């Protein structure tokens, strides 16, 4: 993500890193000891999920590595538009919870008031490189009508927009599936946005997690 800075070490216990073939693929969010939420467009074979990570180059005493035994994309995911861009990953071994590994509660209320949020990830930074250390930035939800003007005809009820007019803080390539956190609840997942990245005129677009409460519960419960 661009124009942010390194997260406080203790502030992102829910953040997941997704790898395939030994390389960073996407972000993700721990929502249950057994389940990680990420973007549908992240689906690949041989996924490895890392929890409790802060710096990707280090072997951190807090980190846990797990394979996935089940990857459940939403049935109605549309690759072209990123509509319904959400996937549940069933961890092969339950998260060893600690100070630095904790699930994040979902925002189940689509009418939730809090518009001050933050995003996190190991995706591309403003200099065009990929950071070792996880980045964080404060951004704000943008009203649906604001965002529809930004991407006329292309924004569904399954999408949320968020950005920062002052610095243009924004998620970027490699941040997919990472948490948009508002009021300390999971409000969205990094889905798509402007390229080059930066939200000064076009906000980032996020999967509207509140819409998927039932589908998540049914899947975890199956
Ligand atoms: C993790 O390492 C890489 C390395 C090179 C990359 C080149 C392109 C992209 S991408 O932008 O096209 N990407 C495709 C993808 C990534 C993992 S699985 C498929 C998606 C496309 C949506 N997205 C987030 C995003 C792009 S711009 C943006 C924003 N808020 N402005 C957010 C991505 O990162 C992602 C890349 C990720």
From Swiss-Prot:
Family: Belongs to the peptidase S1 family. Kallikrein subfamily.
Molecular-function annotations in GO: serine-type endopeptidase activity
Site (Cleavage): 59-60
Induction: By spinal cord injury. This effect is particularly prominent in macrophages, microglia and reactive astrocytes.
UniProt-listed Pfam families: Trypsin (PF00089)
Descriptive protein name: Kallikrein-6
Domain Peptidase S1: start-end pairs: 1-221
Primary enzyme class: hydrolase
Intracellular or extracellular location(s): Secreted; Nucleus, Nucleolus; Cytoplasm; Mitochondrion
EC number per UniProt: 3.4.21.-
Gene Ontology BP term (one): central nervous system development
């Amino acid at each position: 993500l661009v124009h942010g800075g390194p997260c406080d070490k203790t502030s992102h216990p829910y953040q997941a890193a997704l790898y395939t073939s030994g390389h960073l693929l996407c972000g993700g969010v721990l929502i249950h000891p057994l389940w990680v939420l990420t973007a549908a467009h992240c689906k690949k074979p041989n996924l490895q999920v890392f929890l409790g990570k802060h710096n990707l180059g280090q072997q951190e005493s807090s980190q846990e590595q797990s394979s996935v035994v089940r990857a459940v994309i939403h049935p109605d995911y549309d690759a072209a538009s990123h509509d319904q861009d959400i996937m549940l990953l069933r961890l092969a071994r339950p998260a060893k919870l600690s100070e630095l590994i904790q699930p994040l509660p979902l925002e189940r209320d689509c009418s939730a008031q809090t518009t001050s949020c933050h995003i996190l990830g190991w995706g591309k930074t403003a200099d065009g490189d990929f950071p070792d250390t996880i980045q964080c930035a404060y951004i704000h939800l943008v009203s649906r009508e604001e965002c529809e003007h930004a991407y006329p005809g292309q924004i569904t009820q399954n999408m949320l927009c968020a950005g920062d007019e002052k610095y243009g803080k924004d998620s970027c390539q490699g941040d997919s599936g990472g948490p948009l956190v508002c009021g300390d609840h999971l409000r969205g997942l990094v889905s798509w946005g402007n390229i080059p990245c930066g939200s000064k005129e076009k906000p980032g677009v996020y999967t509207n997690v509140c819409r998927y409460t039932n589908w998540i519960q049914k899947t975890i419960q199956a």
